[PDB]
Amino acid sequence: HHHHHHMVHITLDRNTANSWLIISKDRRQVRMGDTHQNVSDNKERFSNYPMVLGAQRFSSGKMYWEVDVTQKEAWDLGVCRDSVQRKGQFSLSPENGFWTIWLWQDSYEAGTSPQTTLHIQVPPCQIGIFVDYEAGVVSFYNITDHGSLIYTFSECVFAGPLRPFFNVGFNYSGGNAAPLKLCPL
Numbered sequence: 001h002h003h004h005h006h007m008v009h010i011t012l013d014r015n016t017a018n019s020w021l022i023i024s025k026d027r028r029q030v031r032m033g034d035t036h037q038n039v040s041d042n043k044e045r046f047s048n049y050p051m052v053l054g055a056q057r058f059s060s061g062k063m064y065w066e067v068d069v070t071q072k073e074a075w076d077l078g079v080c081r082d083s084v085q086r087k088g089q090f091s092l093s094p095e096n097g098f099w100t101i102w103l104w105q106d107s108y109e110a111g112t113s114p115q116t117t118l119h120i121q122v123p124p125c126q127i128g129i130f131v132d133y134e135a136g137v138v139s140f141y142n143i144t145d146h147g148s149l150i151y152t153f154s155e156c157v158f159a160g161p162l163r164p165f166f167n168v169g170f171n172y173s174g175g176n177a178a179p180l181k182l183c184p185l
Protein backbone atom coordinates (compact mmCIF):
# COMPACT_ATOMS: atom_id res chain seq x y z
CA HIS A 1 0.00 0.00 0.00
CA HIS A 2 0.96 3.74 -0.35
CA HIS A 3 -1.16 5.10 2.64
CA HIS A 4 1.91 5.87 4.90
CA HIS A 5 1.84 9.64 3.96
CA HIS A 6 -1.63 10.00 5.72
CA MET A 7 0.14 9.01 9.01
CA VAL A 8 -1.48 10.61 12.12
CA HIS A 9 -0.03 10.70 15.70
CA ILE A 10 -2.54 8.82 17.86
CA THR A 11 -2.60 9.09 21.69
CA LEU A 12 -4.80 7.16 24.11
CA ASP A 13 -7.61 8.85 26.11
CA ARG A 14 -7.19 7.76 29.82
CA ASN A 15 -10.77 8.88 30.60
CA THR A 16 -12.27 6.22 28.25
CA ALA A 17 -10.07 3.33 29.53
CA ASN A 18 -11.43 0.36 31.47
CA SER A 19 -10.33 0.85 35.11
CA TRP A 20 -7.84 -2.10 34.92
CA LEU A 21 -5.78 -0.61 32.06
CA ILE A 22 -2.33 0.96 32.52
CA ILE A 23 -1.49 3.64 29.90
CA SER A 24 2.11 4.84 29.58
CA LYS A 25 3.17 8.45 30.35
CA ASP A 26 3.48 9.20 26.58
CA ARG A 27 -0.12 7.86 26.06
CA ARG A 28 1.21 5.56 23.29
CA GLN A 29 1.12 2.15 25.08
CA VAL A 30 -1.57 0.27 27.02
CA ARG A 31 -1.64 -3.07 28.89
CA MET A 32 -3.94 -5.03 31.22
CA GLY A 33 -3.14 -4.56 34.93
CA ASP A 34 -3.49 -7.41 37.43
CA THR A 35 -6.04 -5.29 39.49
CA HIS A 36 -8.22 -2.07 39.46
CA GLN A 37 -5.87 0.86 38.78
CA ASN A 38 -7.33 3.18 41.47
CA VAL A 39 -9.22 5.61 39.17
CA SER A 40 -12.76 7.03 39.67
CA ASP A 41 -15.60 5.63 37.50
CA ASN A 42 -17.16 7.85 34.79
CA LYS A 43 -19.73 7.41 32.03
CA GLU A 44 -16.98 7.23 29.28
CA ARG A 45 -15.15 4.13 30.66
CA PHE A 46 -15.68 0.78 28.95
CA SER A 47 -16.95 -1.35 31.92
CA ASN A 48 -17.06 -4.99 30.67
CA TYR A 49 -13.94 -5.32 28.48
CA PRO A 50 -10.31 -4.06 28.48
CA MET A 51 -11.04 -1.33 25.88
CA VAL A 52 -9.81 2.27 25.40
CA LEU A 53 -10.24 4.96 22.69
CA GLY A 54 -7.77 7.28 21.00
CA ALA A 55 -8.15 10.98 21.88
CA GLN A 56 -8.31 12.02 18.20
CA ARG A 57 -11.72 12.44 16.47
CA PHE A 58 -11.99 12.16 12.67
CA SER A 59 -14.95 13.51 10.58
CA SER A 60 -13.21 13.90 7.13
CA GLY A 61 -10.09 12.95 5.15
CA LYS A 62 -7.69 10.05 5.07
CA MET A 63 -5.90 8.80 8.22
CA TYR A 64 -3.32 6.00 8.78
CA TRP A 65 -1.67 4.62 11.94
CA GLU A 66 0.18 1.44 13.10
CA VAL A 67 -0.16 -0.73 16.18
CA ASP A 68 2.35 -3.26 17.62
CA VAL A 69 0.67 -6.54 18.75
CA THR A 70 3.90 -8.58 19.36
CA GLN A 71 3.41 -11.73 21.49
CA LYS A 72 -0.30 -11.13 22.24
CA GLU A 73 -2.81 -14.02 22.18
CA ALA A 74 -5.96 -11.84 21.91
CA TRP A 75 -6.80 -8.21 20.93
CA ASP A 76 -9.30 -6.12 18.91
CA LEU A 77 -8.24 -3.09 16.75
CA GLY A 78 -9.91 -0.61 14.47
CA VAL A 79 -12.18 2.48 14.72
CA CYS A 80 -15.55 3.20 16.22
CA ARG A 81 -18.20 5.90 16.44
CA ASP A 82 -17.63 8.42 19.23
CA SER A 83 -21.12 7.48 20.56
CA VAL A 84 -20.65 3.69 20.93
CA GLN A 85 -22.11 2.03 24.06
CA ARG A 86 -19.57 1.96 26.96
CA LYS A 87 -21.49 -0.05 29.64
CA GLY A 88 -22.60 -3.68 29.65
CA GLN A 89 -22.31 -6.40 27.00
CA PHE A 90 -22.23 -5.77 23.23
CA SER A 91 -20.82 -7.29 20.01
CA LEU A 92 -18.28 -5.55 17.77
CA SER A 93 -20.24 -4.90 14.53
CA PRO A 94 -20.83 -2.03 12.11
CA GLU A 95 -24.49 -1.98 13.31
CA ASN A 96 -23.14 -1.14 16.83
CA GLY A 97 -20.65 1.46 15.46
CA PHE A 98 -17.41 -0.61 15.22
CA TRP A 99 -15.07 -1.39 12.25
CA THR A 100 -12.58 -3.86 13.75
CA ILE A 101 -10.50 -7.04 13.32
CA TRP A 102 -9.28 -9.32 16.09
CA LEU A 103 -7.10 -12.25 17.11
CA TRP A 104 -8.78 -14.91 19.29
CA GLN A 105 -7.76 -18.57 19.88
CA ASP A 106 -5.15 -18.68 17.10
CA SER A 107 -7.58 -17.30 14.41
CA TYR A 108 -8.01 -13.79 12.92
CA GLU A 109 -11.55 -12.50 12.17
CA ALA A 110 -13.17 -9.28 10.92
CA GLY A 111 -15.95 -7.83 13.14
CA THR A 112 -18.79 -8.15 10.61
CA SER A 113 -22.21 -9.56 11.63
CA PRO A 114 -21.69 -12.44 11.63
CA GLN A 115 -17.84 -12.39 11.86
CA THR A 116 -15.65 -13.16 8.81
CA THR A 117 -12.63 -15.49 8.76
CA LEU A 118 -9.36 -13.74 7.74
CA HIS A 119 -6.61 -15.56 5.74
CA ILE A 120 -3.21 -14.55 7.18
CA GLN A 121 -0.13 -16.74 6.32
CA VAL A 122 2.36 -14.53 8.28
CA PRO A 123 1.09 -13.76 11.86
CA PRO A 124 1.40 -9.97 12.14
CA CYS A 125 3.56 -8.22 14.76
CA GLN A 126 2.32 -4.75 13.56
CA ILE A 127 -1.06 -3.82 11.97
CA GLY A 128 -1.68 -0.75 9.78
CA ILE A 129 -5.15 0.89 9.90
CA PHE A 130 -6.34 3.16 7.08
CA VAL A 131 -9.58 5.22 7.19
CA ASP A 132 -11.00 7.12 4.19
CA TYR A 133 -13.94 9.02 5.71
CA GLU A 134 -15.41 10.34 2.44
CA ALA A 135 -15.13 6.96 0.65
CA GLY A 136 -16.56 4.99 3.62
CA VAL A 137 -13.53 2.63 3.83
CA VAL A 138 -11.60 1.05 6.71
CA SER A 139 -8.64 -1.16 5.68
CA PHE A 140 -6.17 -3.27 7.66
CA TYR A 141 -2.60 -4.10 6.55
CA ASN A 142 -0.01 -6.73 7.69
CA ILE A 143 3.17 -4.61 8.21
CA THR A 144 5.19 -7.85 9.01
CA ASP A 145 4.25 -9.21 5.49
CA HIS A 146 5.33 -6.19 3.32
CA GLY A 147 2.05 -4.33 4.03
CA SER A 148 -0.22 -7.04 2.52
CA LEU A 149 -4.00 -6.38 2.76
CA ILE A 150 -5.81 -8.16 5.61
CA TYR A 151 -9.37 -6.81 5.24
CA THR A 152 -11.41 -3.89 3.77
CA PHE A 153 -14.75 -2.70 5.14
CA SER A 154 -16.42 -0.78 2.32
CA GLU A 155 -19.79 1.02 2.09
CA CYS A 156 -19.22 2.01 5.72
CA VAL A 157 -21.99 4.11 7.36
CA PHE A 158 -19.90 5.93 10.03
CA ALA A 159 -22.87 8.16 11.09
CA GLY A 160 -20.68 10.31 13.34
CA PRO A 161 -17.13 11.24 14.27
CA LEU A 162 -14.68 8.28 14.45
CA ARG A 163 -12.19 7.42 17.19
CA PRO A 164 -9.29 4.91 17.13
CA PHE A 165 -10.40 1.77 19.06
CA PHE A 166 -8.29 -0.74 21.07
CA ASN A 167 -8.91 -3.88 23.16
CA VAL A 168 -5.82 -5.38 24.90
CA GLY A 169 -7.89 -8.53 25.73
CA PHE A 170 -8.19 -10.47 28.96
CA ASN A 171 -5.25 -12.35 30.42
CA TYR A 172 -6.93 -15.49 31.88
CA SER A 173 -4.12 -17.65 30.30
CA GLY A 174 -1.11 -15.72 31.65
CA GLY A 175 0.09 -15.50 28.01
CA ASN A 176 -1.62 -12.20 27.00
CA ALA A 177 -0.02 -9.59 29.34
CA ALA A 178 1.93 -7.81 26.56
CA PRO A 179 0.91 -4.24 25.62
CA LEU A 180 -0.58 -2.68 22.49
CA LYS A 181 1.86 0.02 21.33
CA LEU A 182 1.31 2.86 18.83
CA CYS A 183 4.35 2.66 16.48
CA PRO A 184 6.33 5.76 15.51
CA LEU A 185 5.91 7.53 12.12
Ligand SMILES: CCn1cc(NC(=O)C2CCC2)cn1
Binds near residue numbers: 094096155156157159
Ligand atom coordinates in the same frame (compact mmCIF):
# COMPACT_ATOMS: atom_id res chain seq x y z
C1 LIG B 1 -25.22 1.34 12.50
C2 LIG B 1 -25.27 1.69 11.04
N1 LIG B 1 -24.80 0.62 10.17
C3 LIG B 1 -23.67 0.56 9.42
C4 LIG B 1 -23.71 -0.61 8.73
N2 LIG B 1 -22.79 -1.16 7.82
C5 LIG B 1 -21.51 -0.74 7.56
O1 LIG B 1 -20.95 0.20 8.17
C6 LIG B 1 -20.79 -1.51 6.49
C7 LIG B 1 -19.33 -1.84 6.84
C8 LIG B 1 -19.54 -3.22 6.21
C9 LIG B 1 -21.06 -3.03 6.36
C10 LIG B 1 -24.91 -1.23 9.10
N3 LIG B 1 -25.58 -0.47 9.96
